[PDB]
Design a protein around this nucleic acid. Structure first.
Ligand SMILES: [Mg+2]
Ligand SMILES: [Mg+2]
Ligand SMILES: [Mg+2]
Ligand SMILES: [Mg+2]
Ligand SMILES: [Mg+2]
Ligand SMILES: [Mg+2]
Ligand SMILES: [Mg+2]
Ligand SMILES: [Mg+2]
Ligand SMILES: [Mg+2]
Ligand SMILES: [Mg+2]
Ligand SMILES: [Mg+2]
Ligand SMILES: [Mg+2]
Ligand SMILES: [Mg+2]
Ligand SMILES: [Mg+2]
Ligand SMILES: [Mg+2]
Ligand SMILES: [Mg+2]
Lengths: 52, 52, 186, 147, 47, 121, 125
RNA sequence: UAAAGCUAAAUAUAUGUAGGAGACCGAUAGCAAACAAGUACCGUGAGGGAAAGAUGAAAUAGUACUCAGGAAUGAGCAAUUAAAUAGUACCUGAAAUCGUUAAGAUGGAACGGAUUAAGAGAGAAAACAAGUAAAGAGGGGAA
RNA sequence: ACGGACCAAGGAGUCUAGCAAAUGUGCAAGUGUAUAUGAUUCUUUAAACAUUUUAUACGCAUAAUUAAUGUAAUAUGUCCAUUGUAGAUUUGUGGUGCCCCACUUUGCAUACAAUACCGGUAAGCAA
């Protein structure tokens, strides 16, 4: 019979979380990767895409 | 612009992550085939050989 | 029928591929496999093999031991397939040229402050294709604590293995079998 | 994850990996540390030799705060200084540092290693060992006792 | 290495900004995947 | 310096929104990215990996000519309107100098095949 | 029994039925490997059911071809069958079971224009 | 500084009542109980304790009329509905078991493996013909 | 020799604690932001983000040994990093085809031994 003291969560190293966030922002700046995630950005000018 | 103050290129109190260093890569330039085609490398390669 | 052993088939006894999934490490493996094949140099074969091994067979190397290994080799390049770490016990450092898979921050700062430089393996492929004036080095592979429990069992006469114990003290496995006054020693 | 468990491989086989003749019965040798000294004796003797018996004196109410004492060797003694501050003491020969290791959490100075020749240093601590104190006196330094 | 800044009518270019150096982190999909499959367990509800 | 073509192959060999494989009729796997002349899943034919490319598709009713010619991450997707064989031959001269003849005639044959498709209203 | 038409060779055509499936109707004909002492099928006695083995495998050069001598690809709408304009002499299409008649008509009339063959272009008519 | 006394907060809550939610179960599951469930029923008594959900959008459409029959019930040239082989034992409607018609086999069991033959059912996606000329109906792309 | 008249549904190595080995990942003489607190966090969010405006919370590791009072790792002649045999890589000549040999140079990991030093015990001398 299922129990409530099954270990529901995990604890993650702080440095690895920061690493993952950093390496994830970098992937946001490569045109081919954004296209390969399913976004329809063929007509865009630049992929980092800053706005005023 | 906040993205350079958060990660410590420009320092600022209570905005920069304390003592955080931005991760480095085990590779300098991941373009392997530009290395393989260099004159230095090509001068060390050996004549192509035959199959059976 | 026919009387062969392991019938007609040859046995090999080691790791065959990368297990890791780092894309940069996979690119490195591809590069040095190509270099090993097309210039059979015995320098690129060994490197192509070493960066396939598991973590326990790529130990770190300290700055002091690296400087000691390079004392009779000025203006040469040391090649390590591991990390290199700092050592507070040294007072001063010379000028060195070292290629390694990883450097720690303090070790990287100390090396560059003395006029040296730090190299990755893709630059060493570009400047020393066949390893001229390069010295291959390894760290201590049997210094891990886990290796202190291996060997003969603790209890066989004149062994050196550590036991697995809750804690350490006069009350924790010191009475019968480790002194003559309780019936025998080891 | 239940996805990768070894038992899923034996799902069609009869015995689930435990054998026809010697089954998987429940506690066929005792419970916990039961049979040691009788029929588990060999395992105890070759993996945990000194297990049985008692030795030594009793200490009835210990209070471990009375004998807390972290140590530091003379190897790591110049490394506590920053490199730039470590640098100027080499050129100038008229000035020496004074180091208080009890501000860093160390209590007793211990004497493994080598100090730099003719490079004086002054150390404060609660305890010293004989070898450490000699090695500090040799390069032209002094030891100071605090509390 | 810089980047243009576009106006909110999508036609004019009104500036340029130097790209921050966090965009040069190595791109590691294996690490991202492994870290993601542990952090996503933390919002689950018991049964 | 943290990215190159070989690293884009490693990152997109398997996980992608353009790969399609056949569960029944086990043979074959196709890459439908917009700049892939063939539909092979190789580094030498995918538009995501290559720096410079040309292609012809439909994309709405009509036929479209496409160029990538992305020199230094200043990716410049140009889009034209193919009208007939002569116009496509002119466009290949104008924008596809970096290619070889063996590629040019392959694209010409592809365009000829595409020019027989139509629907109602 | 070996069957061969052109270059395609089949090394057997009968199925491997499960042991005892003709005598007990709670036993289904789908093949299961016999385990358990004293079987007479696991021990390869002559005169009983045969067991499958890797030796019956097909030629790599002709492993998935239909008698049409083409590979089969299954499509669900018009946009999925556009990669076939470059490889039309090696593939043939088949329409999925759950698409409506109106969609089927368009799929068929486009396959006709592309010069690719349709395996089941007679259903729902 | 014992042998007299009082005193909030930070803590707990398998009960009662109300509110909100889930990588939970889906009528042999989930509480014993999704229904007039601690009910029907059993035991002198302390106690024990089930089974049982679904027509259709609408019955404010639940089957009118005729013929046969003592009646049940059946049949229709007759009737609601999109549908009655959805008719209240009402969504779908498997297997074990039985009925009807056709086709085969049949000297103290039956069924099977290998290999062919004789019958019977079904089939064109390789199991021949691009193109050419004439006429008829269509659908597109350019200038 | 035992179970099996037939059919449908159900039906059996799992969860938690604690230890180890193997492998992947991050940092490295350090490593892990505990309980809490903060925030222009607040459908989701019971998630995610942050760390107190020459810097002593705690665990494991960085030092052992003895019942124990306790004591504690070459030694200041040189920032140097104990000795030998085999051994990966490097340096300079010649031989046969970058490879293998004959010398020459350097000497990782590790295997076999030697030596010095630290804690306990004997022996000798001992204010
Ligand atoms: Mg044989
Ligand atoms: Mg078995
Ligand atoms: Mg059994
Ligand atoms: Mg078959
Ligand atoms: Mg037997
Ligand atoms: Mg009182
Ligand atoms: Mg609920
Ligand atoms: Mg129930
Ligand atoms: Mg319904
Ligand atoms: Mg008879
Ligand atoms: Mg029995
Ligand atoms: Mg029986
Ligand atoms: Mg481990
Ligand atoms: Mg502890
Ligand atoms: Mg002494
Ligand atoms: Mg005296």
């Amino acid at each position: 019979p299922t129990k409530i003291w099954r270990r529901w969560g995990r604890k993650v190293n702080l440095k690895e979380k920061r690493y993952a966030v950093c390496s994830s922002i970098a992937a946001s700046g490569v045109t081919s990767l954004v296209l390969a995630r399913g976004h329809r950005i063929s007509h865009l000018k630049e992929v980092p895409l800053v706005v005023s | 612009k906040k993205l350079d103050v958060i990660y410590g290129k420009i320092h600022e109190k209570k905005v920069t992550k304390k003592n955080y260093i931005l991760p480095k890569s085990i590779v300098h330039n991941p373009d392997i085939y530009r290395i393989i085609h260099s004159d230095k490398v090509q001068a060390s390669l050996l004549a192509k050989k035959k199959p059976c | 029928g026919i009387a062969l052993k392991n019938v007609g088939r040859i046995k090999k006894h080691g790791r065959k591929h990368l297990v890791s999934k780092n894309p940069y490490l996979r690119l490195l493996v591809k590069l040095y496999n190509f270099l090993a094949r097309r210039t059979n140099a015995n320098f690129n074969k060994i490197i192509a093999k070493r960066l396939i091994m598991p973590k326990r067979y790529r130990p770190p190397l300290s700055l002091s031991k690296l400087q000691y290994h390079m004392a009779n080799h000025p203006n040469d390049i040391a090649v390590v397939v591991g990390s290199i770490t700092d050592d507070k016990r040294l007072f001063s450092l010379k000028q060195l040229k070292v290629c390694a898979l990883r450097f720690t921050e303090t070790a990287r700062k100390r090396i560059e402050d003395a006029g040296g430089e730090c190299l990755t393996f893709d630059q060493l492929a570009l400047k020393y294709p066949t390893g001229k004036k390069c010295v291959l080095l390894r760290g201590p592979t049997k210094a891990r604590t886990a290796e202190k429990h291996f060997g003969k069992a603790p209890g066989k006469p004149k062994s050196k293995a550590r036991p697995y114990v809750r804690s350490k003290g006069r009350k924790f496995e010191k009475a019968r079998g480790r002194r003559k006054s309780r019936a025998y020693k080891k | 994850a239940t996805r990768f468990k070894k038992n899923r491989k034996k799902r069609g086989h009869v015995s689930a990996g435990h054998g026809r003749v010697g089954k998987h019965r429940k506690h066929p040798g005792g419970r916990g540390k039961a049979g040691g000294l009788h029929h588990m004796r060999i395992n105890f003797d070759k993996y945990h030799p000194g297990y049985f018996g008692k030795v030594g004196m009793r200490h009835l109410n210990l209070l471990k705060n009375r004998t807390y004492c972290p140590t530091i060797n003379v190897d790591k003694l110049w490394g506590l200084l920053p490199e730039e501050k470590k640098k100027e003491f080499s050129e100038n020969k008229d000035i020496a540092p004074v180091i208080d290791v009890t501000r860093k959490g160390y209590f007793k100075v211990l004497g493994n290693g080598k100090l730099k020749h003719n490079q004086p240093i002054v150390v404060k601590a609660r305890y010293f060992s004989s070898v450490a104190e000699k090695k500090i006196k040799a390069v032209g330094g002094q030891c100071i006792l605090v509390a | 290495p810089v980047a243009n800044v576009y106006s909110t009518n999508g036609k004019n270019v009104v500036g340029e900004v130097e790209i921050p150096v966090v965009f040069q982190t190595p791109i590691r999909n294996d690490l991202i995947q492994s870290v993601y499959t542990n952090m996503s367990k933390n919002r689950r509800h018991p049964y | 310096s943290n990215v190159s073509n070989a690293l884009v192959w490693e990152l997109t060999r398997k996980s992608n929104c353009f790969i399609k494989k056949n569960k029944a009729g086990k043979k074959g796997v196709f890459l439908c990215d917009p700049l892939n002349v063939n539909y092979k899943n190789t580094p030498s034919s995918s538009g995501l990996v290559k720096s410079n490319s040309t292609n012809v598709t439909l994309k709405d009713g009509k036929v479209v000519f496409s160029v990538k010619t992305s020199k230094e991450s200043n990716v410049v997707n140009q889009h034209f309107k193919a009208k007939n064989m002569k116009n496509v031959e002119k466009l290949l001269q104008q924008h596809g100098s970096f290619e070889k003849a063996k590629n040019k005639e392959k694209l010409l044959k592809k365009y000829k095949r595409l020019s027989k498709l139509y629907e109602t209203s | 029994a070996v069957k061969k038409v052109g270059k395609i060779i089949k090394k057997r055509t009968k199925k491997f039925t499960r042991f005892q499936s003709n005598r007990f109707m709670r036993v289904k004909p789908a093949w299961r490997k016999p385990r358990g002492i004293d079987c007479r099928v696991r021990r390869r006695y002559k005169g009983t059911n045969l067991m499958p083995s890797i030796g019956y495998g097909s030629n790599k050069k002709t492993k998935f071809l239909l008698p049409n001598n083409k590979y089969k690809y299954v499509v669900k709408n018009v946009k999925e069958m556009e990669p076939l304009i470059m490889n039309h002499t090696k593939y043939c299409v088949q329409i999925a079971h759950n698409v409506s008649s109106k969609k089927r008509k368009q799929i068929i009339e486009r396959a006709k224009q592309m010069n690719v063959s349709v395996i089941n272009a007679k259903a729902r008519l």
